[PDB]
Every structure is written in structure tokens, then in C-alpha cells.
Design a protein around this ligand. Structure first.
Ligand code: ANP
Ligand code: MG
Ligand code: MG
Lengths: 231, 175
């Protein structure tokens, strides 16, 4: 790749990204929002930090971006609701995807539902639905890699419990029940230290997961293993 | 009449769509595109379900053209290849390009800066009737789309056909 050409693509992509509404400046990536040929879009830029070997740095941005692109395709084909991929710029490591307009993360719905209800029992229907989504996801052998409540959105109308998974930079394919239980254990940890006193709700998700996945029994046994081993 | 959109990521580039029905000189236009005597990309309008489709394909084409990293020989062929769900170049130019018997053709070209394309001369070259792009639904055949992209029941259950189409186009270079 001609150096001058590549650098031009990079400065073209940041010129565009500048000016956009910054949505989240995260650890490894910036998320902006805007329009892409007429559609509402979110752009995830895995920016280089300069604090490391630029070869290692670019390799990392690239692999994350390729992992997410590949997973988002595999989700769509397998009936697992996640954002549509518009365009992936590999010269800069930017993922252009459909914005889930008006979405709320599942974390925010949980915290706002436990400050008015004062009880987690109103969350059970949420729990059941998430069991269905992750069930189908795991049954096509897709591991999310970072199941948290911030990586699930709720698509308006919020109360219908329409879940959209996001952040697939660490996703991958595996039929290994241990890998699936690790996926669930990452979620359980996430619950533990984000939404206190939600243990009832994780078990509710687990029951519905058990019911909607017929490959669940080995997964849950390995999850007990992972809980014990802690890894 | 025509339909034209600026490219968001390449703001000096216009993408123009022209649609024609009752096209008599189909095979002739085909050979004129192989020759390099006609401007733009001649596309099978019956498997385009929306201008957004053409625009995603045109955007990726211009991106790799500027990087000198296209898969096909020219910008005009790259636009058509990006429409394909798979990476087989020849199947893609054959399927999403125009057949000798086509009576509908879509012309897509890309202008950059002020270097214009003789639109009048290009319309001048087609023995058919330039219809509004708004008539594209009449010519698009959902059956053939669902067949050439191989779109699931599972995909239809969580979005549009356009959405599944875009998702395959946008990620085939890594699958
Ligand atoms: N497709 C989308 N539609 C709408 N909002 C989105 C979309 N993708 C991301 N967001 C929002 O932007 C945030 C960033 O998403 P994410 O994919 O988790 O990037 P990230 O690298 O994990 N940033 P961070 O979660 O802070 O580490 C999400 O938590 C949402 O609030
Ligand atoms: Mg995240
Ligand atoms: Mg991330």
C-alpha cells in the first residue's frame, strides 16, 4: 500500500470523524454518530495511542475491527439482532454501522428500574428475553467475548424488550461449552459489580437460557466449573 | 430523470444513477462497456433494491480506488463487484452486470471535482427510455434478489432485505 495514499486515507477519515458528535471516548476506541449516505450511523474508530510499537498498535486495531466486522455479519445471518455493517475502513480501523436510534443500554434500564421499583422483580421479563438472545447466539457457536449490560441496547419502544448486542471486537466462534460458560461468567461478573442485588435477575436469565438452548446443560456445568476455578 | 448523491467520506465525488426501461440495444451497450467506449457501470437493475445499495458499493469502490487496492481492473468494474455477496470476480460482473437480453439497465458513474461526464451523450447511446429512479421498485424483482444473495428466513426476521444485503456487501472482504 503506497505510503502517501494510505496516509491520505487516514487524514481523510479523521477529517470526516472530526465534526461528528462524539458519543463515547472509550479505552481503545472512540464512538461517533452521524449520517452515512442518508442513514443514521455510528462510527467506531479504534485509534492508535502512540504509546507502543506502531506495528503492534496497528495490528491490534486491525484485529479488533476484523473480529467485530466478522461477528456482526455472522449475527445478521443467524437471526441475532445487532447493528448492520455499512462500511469498514481498514486503513484507519473505523467501523461504520447503523445507529440503533434512541437506544438505551441495558445497564441504564437496570439502574433506572431499580431506583423507582426498589426491587429487581420487575426485571424478570428483561432477564427472560436476554436468555433467549444469548441462547440463540451461543447455539450458532458465537462467543460474544465481553458480555456486559453496557454492550446490550434496548431498541425503542423500550418496553417491548428489543435487545441489540454490540461491541464484538473480542468475538469468535466456538462450540466449546467451556468457552460459552466463560462468556456467561463474564456476564455474571458484570452484573455483580454494576447492578448490586441483581443476583435474582442473573438466575432468571440462566433459567431462561437453560430453556431456550438445547445445548445448555454442558454450558451450565462448565459455568459452575468456571465459577469455582474463577477462570 | 437522474438521481445524484454526494459521497460522505469523499465529498468531492458525486455518484449518479440513471435508469432505463425498454432497452433495445442491450448487447451493444454490453460490448461498448467491455471496450471502454461508454461511461460508467452497467448494472442489472432487477437486483438493486435501493440506491443505498449502489452508494455503499460506490463508497467502497472509491475508497479502494484511492488506495490503489481494488479487486477489479477499473473503478467501473469495482462498483459492480462490490454488489456481489461473494468474492468471485467473474460471477459478480456476470450476475450484477447487464445481460444481452436486458430491457432494463441502470447506469452508475462517479464524477470527481468538476470533471463532468457527458450525460447527454451517454443517454444518447441507449435505445430505451430513461425513467425516474423512483420506478426502480417496478423493475427490482424481490425473488431474484432473495435468490442471488441467498437471504434467510432468519435474516428477514430481524431487519430488511436491504439490511442483510448491505451486511454481506460490507463484510465479504473479510469472510
Ligand atoms: N450501533 C450503535 N447504535 C447506538 N449506540 C451505539 C451503537 N454502538 C455503540 N453505541 C453506544 O456507544 C457505546 C460504545 O459501544 P461499544 O461497542 O461498547 O464501544 P466500546 O469500545 O466498548 N466503548 P466502551 O464500552 O466505553 O469501552 C455503547 O455503550 C453505546 O452507548
Ligand atoms: Mg463496550
Ligand atoms: Mg470496544
Amino acid at each position: 500500500p503506497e505510503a502517501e495514499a494510505l496516509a491520505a486515507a487516514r487524514e481523510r477519515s479523521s477529517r470526516f470523524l472530526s465534526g461528528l458528535e462524539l458519543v463515547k471516548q472509550g479505552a481503545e476506541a472512540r464512538v461517533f454518530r452521524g449520517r452515512f449516505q442518508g442513514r443514521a450511523a455510528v462510527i467506531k474508530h479504534r485509534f492508535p495511542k502512540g504509546y507502543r510499537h506502531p506495528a503492534l498498535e496497528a495490528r491490534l486495531g486491525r484485529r479488533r475491527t476484523v473480529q467485530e466486522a466478522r461477528a456482526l455479519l455472522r449475527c445478521r445471518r443467524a437471526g441475532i439482532s445487532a447493528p448492520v455493517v455499512f462500511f469498514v475502513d481498514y486503513a484507519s480501523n473505523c467501523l461504520y454501522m447503523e445507529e440503533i436510534e434512541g437506544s438505551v443500554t441495558v445497564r441504564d434500564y437496570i439502574q433506572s428500574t431499580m431506583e423507582t421499583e426498589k426491587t429487581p422483580q420487575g426485571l424478570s421479563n428483561l432477564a427472560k428475553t436476554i436468555g433467549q438472545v444469548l441462547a440463540r447466539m451461543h447455539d450458532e457457536d458465537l462467543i460474544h467475548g465481553d458480555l456486559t449490560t453496557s454492550n446490550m441496547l434496548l431498541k425503542p419502544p423500550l418496553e417491548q424488550l428489543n435487545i441489540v448486542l454490540i461491541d464484538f471486537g473480542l468475538s469468535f466462534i466456538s462450540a466449546l461449552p467451556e468457552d460459552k460458560g466463560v462468556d456467561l461468567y463474564v456476564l455474571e461478573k458484570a452484573f455483580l459489580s454494576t447492578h448490586p442485588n441483581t443476583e435474582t435477575v442473573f438466575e432468571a436469565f440462566l433459567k431462561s437460557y437453560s430453556t431456550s438452548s438445547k445445548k445448555a446443560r454442558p454450558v451450565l456445568k462448565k459455568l459452575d466449573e468456571v465459577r469455582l476455578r474463577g477462570r | 430523470m437522474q438521481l445524484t448523491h454526494q459521497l460522505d467520506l469523499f465529498p468531492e465525488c458525486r455518484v449518479t444513477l440513471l435508469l432505463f426501461k425498454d432497452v433495445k440495444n442491450a448487447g451493444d451497450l454490453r460490448r461498448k462497456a467491455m471496450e471502454g467506449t461508454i461511461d460508467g457501470s452497467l448494472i442489472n437493475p432487477t437486483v438493486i433494491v435501493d440506491p443505498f445499495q449502489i452508494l455503499v458499493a460506490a463508497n467502497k469502490a472509491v475508497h479502494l480506488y484511492k488506495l490503489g487496492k481494488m479487486k477489479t481492473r477499473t473503478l467501473s468494474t469495482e462498483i459492480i463487484f462490490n454488489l456481489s455477496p461473494n468474492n468471485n470476480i467473474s460471477e459478480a460482473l456476470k450476475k450484477f452486470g447487464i445481460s444481452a437480453n436486458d430491457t432494463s439497465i441502470l447506469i452508475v458513474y462517479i464524477e470527481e471535482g468538476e470533471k463532468q461526464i457527458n450525460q447527454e451523450y451517454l443517454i444518447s447511446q441507449v435505445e430505451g427510455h430513461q425513467v425516474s429512479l423512483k420506478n426502480l421498485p417496478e423493475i427490482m424483482n424481490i425473488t431474484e434478489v432473495k435468490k442471488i444473495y441467498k437471504l434467510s428466513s432468519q435474516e428477514e426476521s430481524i431487519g430488511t432485505l436491504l439490511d442483510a444485503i448491505i451486511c454481506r456487501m460490507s463484510t465479504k472482504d473479510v469472510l
